[PDB]
Amino acid sequence: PKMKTHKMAKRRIKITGTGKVMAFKSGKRHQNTGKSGDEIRGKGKGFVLAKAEWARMKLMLPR
Amino acid sequence: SKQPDKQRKSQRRAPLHERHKQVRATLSADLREEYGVRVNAGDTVEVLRGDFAGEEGEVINVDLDKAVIHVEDVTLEKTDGEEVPRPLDTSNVRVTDLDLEDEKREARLE
RNA sequence: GGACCCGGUGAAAUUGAACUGGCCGUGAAGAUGCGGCCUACCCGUGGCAGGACGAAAAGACCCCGUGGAGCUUUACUGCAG
RNA sequence: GCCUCUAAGCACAACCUGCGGGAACCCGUACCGCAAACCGACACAGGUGGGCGGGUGCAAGAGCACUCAGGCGCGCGGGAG
RNA sequence: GGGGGAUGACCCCAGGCGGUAGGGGAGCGUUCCCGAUGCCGAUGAAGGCCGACCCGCGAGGCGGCUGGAGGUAAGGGAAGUGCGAAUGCCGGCAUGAGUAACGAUAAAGAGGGUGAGAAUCCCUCUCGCCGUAAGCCCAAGGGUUCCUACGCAAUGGUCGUCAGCGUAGGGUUAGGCGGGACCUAAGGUGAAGCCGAAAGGCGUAGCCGAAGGGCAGCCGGUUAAUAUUCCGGCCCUUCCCGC
RNA sequence: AGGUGGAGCCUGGGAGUGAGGGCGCGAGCGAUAACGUCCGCGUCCGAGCGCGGGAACAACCGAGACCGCCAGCUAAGGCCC
RNA sequence: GAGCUGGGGCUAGGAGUGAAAAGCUAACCGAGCCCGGAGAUAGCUGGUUCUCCCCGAAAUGACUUUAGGGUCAGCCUCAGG
RNA sequence: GAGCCGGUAGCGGGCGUGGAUCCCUGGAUGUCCGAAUGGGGGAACCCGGCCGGCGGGAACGCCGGUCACCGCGCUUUUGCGCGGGGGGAACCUGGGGAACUGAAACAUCUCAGUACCCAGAGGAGAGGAAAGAGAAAUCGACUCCCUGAGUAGCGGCGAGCGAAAGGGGACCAGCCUAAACCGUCCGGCUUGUCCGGGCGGGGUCGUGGGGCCCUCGGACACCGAAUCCCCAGCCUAGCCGAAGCUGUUGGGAAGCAGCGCCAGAGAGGGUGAAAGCCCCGUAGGCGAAAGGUGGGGGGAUAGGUGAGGGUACCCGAGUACCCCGUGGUUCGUGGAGCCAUGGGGGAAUCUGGGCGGACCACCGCCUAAGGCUAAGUACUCCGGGUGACCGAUAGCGCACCAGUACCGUGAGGGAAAGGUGAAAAGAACCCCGGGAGGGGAGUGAAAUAGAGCCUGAAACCGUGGGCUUACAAGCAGUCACGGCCCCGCAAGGGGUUGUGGCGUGCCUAUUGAAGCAUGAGCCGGCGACUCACGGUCGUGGGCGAGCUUAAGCCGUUGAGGCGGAGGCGUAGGGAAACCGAGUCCGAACAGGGCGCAAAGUCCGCGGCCGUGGACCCGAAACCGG
């Protein structure tokens, strides 16, 4: 039987039929960061390769 | 009785007469052909195998017990000397003179 | 009084295996077994301890495992009272 | 056990005594037993509680040397030194 | 890899080929399930024992001797499968080694006797060791080890005709000795009573509980063994019926 | 450009070691001391980079071990025994 | 004599007892012993089998209560383009 | 159905077809212990009342039978008559209830409500007609299997834990009582109208019950039992039961050959070496009882409920509901409900009162705060069947004078050890010898099959023979050349070595090893990358929409075949609303994801990855009894 860090599955996660997977930018923001603006324009999404294998897998099945 | 060993279980552990079941057989032409129902046991016959094969003799002792019987004829002598009746391998056993001079013998088998 | 010679009895740890010499050199840096050399018949028993890194025991002194177990206080938390 | 007595029954039949007849069970004993028969896995110079512990000598005394009664020569013997 | 492969195979040359972790491909025997229009063997299943044909090989075949009954699959399937090796587990078997030990330095030696055979048994005569023990006794523990007639295979750290070893037979008797048929402390139980989540805890009286209390005898004889019990002579106690 | 010839690139499954040393050289430290360590450039060994040599000696000079015992040229290194 | 002792019992093993060293608790109690969690976990240690073919490793770098582990890279191998 | 006094084969004696041994079932004895129970007690022993013969009581008095523990009802009277407790491998619910270990620490968490202990029910308990579920105004007992779903979701959001309604399936199934309203009374207070307990009314299934007034209406509706025989199934033995013989190599044949038969029963096993036909009490197939336990099924028992409107109304509970403190639930303090309760307040009887997840309005559901309820799932001590299950170090450890010998005070541990043969025909007799044991004879196919006596290998100890050995080094040894010795694969090889020639053993871990680093004394056998569910690529192949749960049926062999809830692909993009081959950011045509079909899917077989004790053994320790 199987499941998955359901977690990460929650937060950051979720694949495209492409056989690929992505989660939201993730620079700094949302903690400390009076910082700047344009930097703001620094949170869309980030697709990390290689590892996204543990991931996907470990999730595998439903997502 | 549907397995190998349940044969020792309803033959000798059960009714010893079940071993009678063993004294089963036939014999000469007469009697036989005539049928085969209603035995005698300590009757006469003449084996049909083992060196002694094709021999003439009679039924001495219903040994069911040992699992077979003895045939005066069929026998042997020791080494000290004296003669003696050998063991009768139930197997090769023949009976034609169907012991029945005894009205009760003729009222069962022949 | 053993030890030694007789008769009687008759174990035991360790050990891959082995007919296992000294030298001066060497190799993983303290070699009977590798090189050169010198003495060198085959076996034994009564002994004498040096070497076989002899035996005993997978160091207790050491460090390493985000091992364990006991006592301590202004260590953390929690319970008993 | 001895004496005091309620309940209570004796109180010519309750207890004490005297004589005569009658009754008296259950289970334990052998031999070892400062010990090859007991604990130490073994015929292991280890331990194990009570009774006078015979005498002669030593100031006395279960200390001591010899021996009384009784016990035993150790359960492996010779032979060199 | 490439030049034509008919299924093999054959020819060129290029082209290497030492290899532990470790990666890919190919084969071998091992016990089983097929018996994909499969069955051998008393003139041997199989394992064993020994070998100068077949394969790179791990194995094959095959022939000679052994041994008492099996099982083989031409092909695919399945799996408790291949071992020096874990100071591995289990079993046997060698070492040292005919050296180390005889369990207290309280010593023996001689004559006869029995026996197949006696330093190691029996009788006997010298001699040594006890002697507060290497004494008899009561206990506790162990339970036939005790005696008698036979016997030595192993146990006796040598023998062994000896045994506290084997088999057989036999041995231990009590109104008064000890235990009970009497008594309680500790303690343990424990109707009632008291409190636990349940199991349980405590616990009065009464009961269990002993070489503590209490209670009626002793000396001699008598077998291979028993004995205050068996003999006998002497000394008693409790209960019961009668008067 | 390419004489080469046989490495190259992407996708994808299966891995192992995740700590090495030795030598030359250029640097660091260090008594320019160590078979010291510390980074680099090449090699080297990897428990077989097994054989030759330097006596012996992984290892430094030459060498790439498919197999062929009674062929032939050489390497490095040697040719008085 | 806080004397030695037999016999009878009481306490008990995270708790007892202790004229108290952590002693003694059925011959090694710094927390007994048997069965049970259970084949506890165990970067460490060993151990890790029949043949043969093909190629051919790393002992660095980056982050770690991580440094004698292991993630990702770098160097291997096989399938297709 | 004709043999026997059990495994004892041996001596000595005996019962038996005017139905013995033994197979069955129901019996009468059942000594002492053990819940023990009459009383005591270190079990298996020692003690007391009533009856009892009366018994030797030779001119003198005893065992036997018996009897009675204590907690439970209650005919209470002075209490007479019923139940219980002790077990029991595994499985069941309640009562109580833990660390390891994972999280690569560890306090939260996990292992778990597991392991253990306790109580107790049963042959099955568990549970069980709904103050239920959810929302299509849809569903309805409880349970269990598949599925839902590893989803919704819980969380130092880390390791992990991880529901349910709905759909498919097995089964079906429903009932009661306080429940003061009515009347009956019985007992009290003290006469009224109070509480009380036995009788009925009703004694609620899905809202009703009574009490009143008129319509009523005037026989098929059996449960969990109750009942009768019924097929009562089994209970052990029930018994028939097809068909060959000659010849033959053989110590033995059932083999090799010739003819011959069976047949719904060529299942196997025993038969002197392999039979359909020799034995088999087998499958063929029919058989079978007077006693012990069912459904099916037949009947009455049938216990039992079963229609109409109206009325102001009184009638399933002592605590619902609320505050705090825990539980269970997927819920780990949370926006956090339902149900269950530890303490404290302490409502209502049908416009009542909980519920649909804080709460509130409205809608929708349900009617508590007592009880009984077979069947559908679990578990093997028992008996049977079957085996790609084992063969004496494997299997349960234990294939038969083993949970016994044996160490342990105890709890507890806990072994080893099977095989002659066709049957004893098991070795009379003679020999050396105290014997054991060895030499002959005899059984015999063979005893080097010979009494722990089938096969009986190695290691290891012997007896002879070939070769070889005293100026010689290395485990090894292997290459050369020589002599002796044998040529059942001869002009080629065997074996042994005298010399010389080149040579550092073998394993793990190691930068590196001969090793002086460890591993191993020697031989034989055991002994270590497995299985399951998932997922993951590769491949062998069946359809492209592909594919099957659980179950229903069919089943020497037993033959699969139907089952269409589901689940992956059929677009995806997004937190979502939602849009959609387009979409999210945004107010901009600038990018991210995708479109572009290339389409899988099931299965088989594999290299792997997660959960697993899971490559195999290894410790110190923690936790329970």
CA B24 → C1' E147, Å? 63
Q: Hey, what amino acid is at A27?
A: G
CA B40 → C1' F64, Å? 98
Task: Identify the helix (H) or strand (E) that includes residue A55.
Answer: helix A54-59
Decide the pairing of beta strands B44-45 and B57-58.
antiparallel
Distance CA B93, CA B69 (A): 9
Q: Which nucleotides of G are covered by protein (CB under 7 A)?
A: 72-73
For chain A, breaks with the C atom over 2.5 A from the next N come after none
Enter the DSSP assignment of A46. Answer: E
Q: How was this structure determined?
A: X-ray
Which of B54, B49, B58, B51 has its CA nearest to residue B96? B58
CA B88 → C1' H467, Å? 62
- Classify A4 in phi/psi space as left (phi over 0), alpha (psi -120 to 50) or beta: left
Q: Which nucleotides of H are covered by protein (CB under 7 A)?
A: 1-4, 17-18, 21-23, 150-155, 157-162, 236-241, 246-247, 250-254, 267-272, 275, 278-282, 384-386, 422-428, 441-445, 533-536, 568-575, 592-595, 610
Domains, chain B, with CATH or none: 1-110 (2.30.30.30)
Distance CA B98, CA B100 (A): 6
Q: Which residues contact B59 (CB under 8 A, 6 or more apart)?
A: B40, B41, B42, B43, B44, B45, B69, B71, B95, B99
Taking CA atoms, B35 is separated from B31, B32, B58, B75, in Å, by 7, 5, 21, 30
